[PDB]
Ligand binder design. Structure first.
Ligand SMILES: C[C@H](N)[C@]12C[C@H]3C[C@H](C[C@H](C3)C1)C2
Lengths: 23, 23, 23, 24
């Protein structure tokens, strides 16, 4: 499902940003 | 599956909100 | 997939916790 | 079995762990 695939990419991005935001 | 679809929408929302919370 | 169903529930939970902490 | 979706699932579970530990 493209909605699930899109949420997958976004959740990967979210953790990257959250880690960078804590660094 | 409705639960996976719901979490997908919710994860999209989550990142939007978090980004805004930092801006 | 139990990983995907589990991450769905956990993702819903994470957003609920973020909102509560925000509110 | 989509590796994107499995990866994001694993990452989403870790994200919550980090958030909770950062909360506690
Ligand atoms: C909401 C999660 N980040 C989640 C992770 C995986 C991708 C999508 C759907 C579900 C599995 C739940 C988003």
């Amino acid at each position: 499902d493209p909605l699930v695939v899109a949420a997958s990419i976004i959740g990967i991005l979210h953790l990257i940003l959250w880690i960078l935001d804590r660094l």
